[PDB]
Amino acid sequence: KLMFKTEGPDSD
Amino acid sequence: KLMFKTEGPDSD
Amino acid sequence: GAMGSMERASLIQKAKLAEQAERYEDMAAFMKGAVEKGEELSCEERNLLSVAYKNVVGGQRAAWRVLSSIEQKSNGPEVREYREKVETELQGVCDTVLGLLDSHLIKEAGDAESRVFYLKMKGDYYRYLAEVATGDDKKRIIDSARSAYQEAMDISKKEMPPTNPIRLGLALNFSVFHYEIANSPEEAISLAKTTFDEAMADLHTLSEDSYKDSTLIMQLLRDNLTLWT
Amino acid sequence: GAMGSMERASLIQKAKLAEQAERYEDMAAFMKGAVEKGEELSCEERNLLSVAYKNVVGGQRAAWRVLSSIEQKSNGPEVREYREKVETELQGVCDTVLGLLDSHLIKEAGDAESRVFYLKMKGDYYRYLAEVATGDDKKRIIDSARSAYQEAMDISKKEMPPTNPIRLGLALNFSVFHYEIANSPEEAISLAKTTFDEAMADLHTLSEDSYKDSTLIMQLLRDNLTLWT
Ligand SMILES: C=CC(=O)Nc1ccccc1-c1csc(C(=N)N)c1
Ligand SMILES: C=CC(=O)Nc1ccccc1-c1csc(C(=N)N)c1
């Protein structure tokens, strides 16, 4: 799935 | 620490 | 719980060690133990709490998406069973964080910086619950996320400058909530654009270091806008 | 244990799903459950077992090294306490794997391919125990690793061609054992060079696919030799 930018560590 | 190549997934 | 016998300061120190070791489950358990001491958290400690659980839930979300995709393609019980196992563990982590926030981080947070931080977290963890929710429980979970984010937004607009990194990260996450959870892409785009433009106009007030903090999150807003428009 | 009620085939399928999801702790627990069914493992299932635990212990080893380095630099009790916590968990995983091998994977393994695979694993997990061991228990653990590797080597030389990937990976790991656990760098270099040269001379017998399998591990031997000479 295309994930959009969210705050903090990009851990997924 | 310098780790040498061992077999299988380089998981450390 | 199992951290009840460890000093608060020791728990914080071990959370920082666990972060260095990339042991995020341990980091989260140490920070849960620190929160349960009952004292309010400093900015650094809030960040340790958030980083720990973001990493834990992030791994679960990524796993859940892989499994959901295999399950959808396959539509024996094993894929569904295992996707459910991962889903329940994810829901458990979200419930643990939400539990810390309601007992009693949010109610004890009076400063804007701490109260906005926690309400953004409440929005985020209801959002992760919404990502896996299916039906009417889904509607209620979405509204809980919306409510938390909105209250955080209201405080941040009244109490923080438009370049404040907490305010910026809140708007970023609320805009992603709108885009893909609430199916409100126009609200998402409007929020991201207004947030970006108001921060841009305030950058001249900042030091070199604060400028770097603010522009880093503004670039994430721009990244999303580029994909959405 | 907790997998006693799940079908063997379901456990194998879920191990493969867990691998895709990068959920290696789950993958290891599913494979432990499959082993405990009491039936011998196929080549694919042996590989699922090994990959799962290699990933789990790999994360622990990496964490332990980070913590040991901070501890050594620092020489309160917290760093030592937390390094000990991680160390005990690592030892627990090694003991679990060694337990599966002795009860009863090794004794039930009669074919060279399966017996060498398991004895190499026994060498590897005693080697990970040796990495964290301190003193005389250290000597006994080192000898246990040596013994397992040596028996695997003896079988592999009698029963497998020099390009066999299991044989090659065994020699690779035994050479690293010599270099940095047994403090025998010359034995390590000699083993890696002889293994590489004998495989090189046998590559002409292989299909394109087997050639690729063998040369991949030969490149790891060369990588080590380049660093050691
Ligand atoms: C590197 C140290 C550092 O930045 N410490 C802090 C000091 C004051 C406020 C916040 C922090 C902080 C932000 S993220 C973070 C983390 N440990 N991931 C810690
Ligand atoms: C991709 C599938 C595949 O290679 N399956 C096999 C079939 C026959 C023997 C071994 C394997 C195997 C080697 S590593 C591995 C893993 N799942 N990591 C599986």
DSSP C172-208: HHHHHIIIIIS--HHHHHHHHHHHHHHHHTTGGGS-H
CA distances from C88 to C56, C85, C91, D6 (A): 14, 5, 5, 19
C-alpha span between A5 and C175 (Å, rounded): 10
One-character DSSP codes across D101-167: IIIIITTT--SHHHHHHHHHHHHHHHHHHHHH--SHHHHHHHHHHHHHHHHHHHHHHHHS-TT-HHH
The shortest C-alpha distance from D81 to chain C (Å) reads 9
Q: Which residue of D has its CA nearest to C65?
A: D21
| Interface touch C13/D78, C-beta < 8 Å | yes
C-alpha span between C113 and C42 (Å, rounded): 10
What angle in degrees, to the nearest 10, is found between the helix axes of C185-200 and C208-228?
150
Q: Measured on CA atoms in the order D92, D98, D101, D103, is the torsion positive or negative?
A: negative
Method: X-ray
C-alpha span between D58 and D76 (Å, rounded): 28
Other CB atoms closer than 10 Å to residue C213's CB: what's the count? 15
**CB-facing half-sphere around the CA of A4: CA atoms within 13 A:** 23
Q: Give the tokens for residue D61.
A: 């080893």
Name where chain B breaks: residue before each gap, C-N > 2.5 Å. Answer: none
Please give the distance of CA D71 from its chain centroid, rounded to a whole number.
Answer: 27
| Interface touch D173/B12, C-beta < 8 Å | no
Nearest residue (CA) to ligand 2, atom 10 = D44
Question: Cα torsion at C124, C126, C130, C136 (round to 10°)?
Answer: -150
Nearest residue (CA) to ligand 1, atom 3 = C44
Instruction: Yes or no: say if C180 and C129 are a contact pair by the CB < 8 Å rule.
Output: no
- Omega prior to D204 cis, within 30 of 0: no
C-alpha span between C34 and C45 (Å, rounded): 9
Q: Give the tokens for residue C79.
A: 């894929």
Q: Minimal CA–CA distance to A6: which of C121, C92, C229?
A: C121
CATH superfamily of D8-228: 14-3-3 domain (1.20.190.20)
C-alpha span between C45 and D120 (Å, rounded): 45
Largest CA distance in chain A: 19
Long-range contacts formed by C78-86: CB under 8 A, 24+ apart: C78/D10, C78/D13, C78/D14, C78/D17, C79/D17, C81/D14, C82/D14, C82/D17, C82/D18, C82/D26, C85/D26, C86/C60, C86/D21, C86/D23
Which residue in this structure is represented by tokens 């228990």? D137
> Which amino acid makes up residue D53?
Y
What angle in degrees, to the nearest 10, is found between the helix axes of C24-35 and C8-20?
160
- Sorted by where each begins, the domain ranges of chain C are 8-228
Which residue in this structure is represented by tokens 């895709």? D20
One-character DSSP codes across D166-188: HHHHHHHHHHHIIIIIS--HHHH
Largest CA distance in chain C: 61
| Interface touch B7/D220, C-beta < 8 Å | yes
Q: Which atom of ligand 1 is nearest to the CA of C46?
A: 10
CA distances from D85 to C14, C198, D81 (A): 11, 48, 6
Q: What DSSP designation does D40 have?
A: P
Other CB atoms closer than 10 Å to residue D225's CB: what's the count? 16
E strand or H helix at D2: none
Mutate one of D74, D78, D90, D93 to test the C interface: name it (highest C CB count within 10 A). D78
- Omega prior to C104 cis, within 30 of 0: yes
CA distances from C129 to C96, C108, C211 (A): 12, 24, 34
